């Protein structure tokens, strides 16, 4: 037997791919144990969608207690807009070390092979496989490979030896994290590097396979072999307010607004949008939400909106503050455009549908995120200029890039274009596409005898 051990980081994005993942996974009838916390797994599977989990068939989960730990509410004011609050989390996290090392030995006492599929962020928890002979570990690298793969060849001095325009442009990487997680990615990468066997990343060779194909060259992965087996999300769905909502609207009529779970606005910022948004005279769906703690399910979320605000776009906007259906809601066909942080599993969510992005990055890989989907993908538009990052964002900036993508000639050119990316990836998970051709190798590499 063959079995599969996902161990996901504990925050909402990275707990979501490897359930789908597992979901992509599931028709090779292979069995899969997936592996976080008892908090986690209540958030994963509270807000996971578009996936009926109740009958996948070789599907385990281990709840693994950890250690307490403080769960800080965001700070808005944080220079990096990084979700610094979550440090306490990462270091909780290592203590599933413990019970994980007990698991691997367990499962590969009985199995031909354990096959331990792994968050890079979560390197140190696993790393036991390298004692294991039957236990091999492929790393999840989770954001997009353009991002990935131009902060490994500015580390290696920039050869020439890979050409490609883009990357004499990348946005500067300056004050986009704090130097505690530059640490901890380091550290952890560096560990995955010791003792993976291959590299997962979540993303198609339609969208990047440029940039895929230049990182499994030896000069930058060396025999670490990388698999391209996303888009993660679903390709299709199969009523929420949020729907009702877009159901009374003309088609491809509404900007959808919404920034993931580490983003935390100032209140000043946030009054920018509002202004923005109703600036533009669109319709629009706004995610107004504080970002995630470390615990989603301790203590009390953070906003205020401007006098007479929300009177004056009952019409034309809906506000929502809590969890929405977010795949679904980038299928609806009045969904005209997606107002984003960049976040890669929200661009893959918006590039699938093929919504048209008005990209507004804030930290870690959303910058490069965004230059791939704006400047070498051509599919949105910028919100924000990156080279002012530390400026607050004016409501005129705002209505500017939503008229833009959802009433005006340009928009129809670049939703043109989103158009045919979203049905690229789609065929790539189709049989015969891309990305079910690596799925198809990938399963073969790890069941191999
Ligand atoms: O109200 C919401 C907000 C987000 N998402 C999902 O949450 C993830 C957001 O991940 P992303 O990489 O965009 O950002 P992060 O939250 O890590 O900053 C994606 O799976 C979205 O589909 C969702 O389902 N509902």
Redesign the pocket.
């Known amino acids: 037997q063959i079995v599969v051990v996902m161990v996901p980081f504990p ?3 990275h707990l ?1 791919q490897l359930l789908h993942l597992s979901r992509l996974i599931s028709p090779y009838n292979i069995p899969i144990h997936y592996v976080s916390t008892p908090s986690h797994v209540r958030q994963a599977k509270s ?1 996971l ?1 578009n996936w009926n989990i109740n009958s996948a068939t070789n599907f385990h989960i281990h709840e693994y207690p950890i250690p307490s730990f403080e769960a800080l509410p965001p700070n808005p004011n944080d220079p990096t807009k990084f979700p610094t609050h979550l440090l306490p989390l990462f270091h909780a996290s290592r203590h599933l070390c413990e019970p994980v090392t007990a698991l691997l030995h367990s499962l590969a006492a009985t199995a031909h092979r354990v096959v331990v599929i792994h968050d890079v962020l979560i390197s140190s928890v696993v790393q036991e496989v390298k004692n294991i002979p039957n236990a091999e570990a492929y790393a999840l690298q989770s954001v997009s490979v353009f991002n990935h793969f131009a902060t490994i060849w500015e580390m290696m001095g920039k050869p020439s030896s890979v050409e490609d325009e883009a990357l004499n442009h990348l946005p500067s990487q300056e004050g986009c994290v704090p130097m505690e997680f530059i640490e901890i990615l380091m550290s952890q990468s560096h560990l995955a590097n010791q003792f993976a066997t291959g590299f997962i990343h979540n993303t198609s060779k339609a969208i990047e396979g440029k940039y895929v194909d230049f990182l499994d060259k030896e000069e930058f992965s060396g025999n670490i072999k990388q698999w391209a087996l996303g888009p993660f ?1 679903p390709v299709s769905v199969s009523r929420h307010k949020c729907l009702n909502f877009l159901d009374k609207q003309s088609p491809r009529s509404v900007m959808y607004v ?1 920034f ?4 935390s606005f100032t209140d000043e910022q946030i009054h920018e949008l509002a202004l923005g948004l109703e600036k533009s005279e669109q319709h629009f769906i706004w ?1 107004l ?1 504080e970002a995630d703690r470390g615990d989603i399910y301790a203590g009390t979320e953070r906003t205020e909106l401007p006098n007479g605000y929300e009177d004056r776009i009952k019409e034309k906007g809906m506000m929502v503050r809590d ?5 679904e809601i980038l299928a609806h066909p009045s969904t005209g455009g997606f107002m ?2 960049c ?5 893959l ?1 918006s590039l699938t549908m093929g919504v048209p992005v008005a990209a507004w990055p804030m930290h870690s890989d959303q910058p490069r995120n965004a230059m791939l989907v704006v400047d070498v993908l051509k599919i949105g538009t910028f919100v924000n200029d990156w080279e002012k990052r530390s400026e607050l964002v004016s409501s005129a900036m705002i209505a500017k890039a939503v008229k833009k993508l959802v009433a005006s000639k340009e928009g129809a050119e670049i939703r043109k274009r989103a158009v045919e990316m979203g049905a690229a990836v789609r065929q790539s998970v189709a049989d015969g596409g891309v990305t079910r051709m690596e799925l198809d190798s990938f399963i073969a590499q790890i069941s191999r005898i």
């Open positions: 925050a909402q994005s979501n807000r969608q999300n919404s993931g779970t580490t983003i995610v939400r969890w929405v259906p977010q795949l984003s942080h976040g890669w599993n929200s661009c969510d």
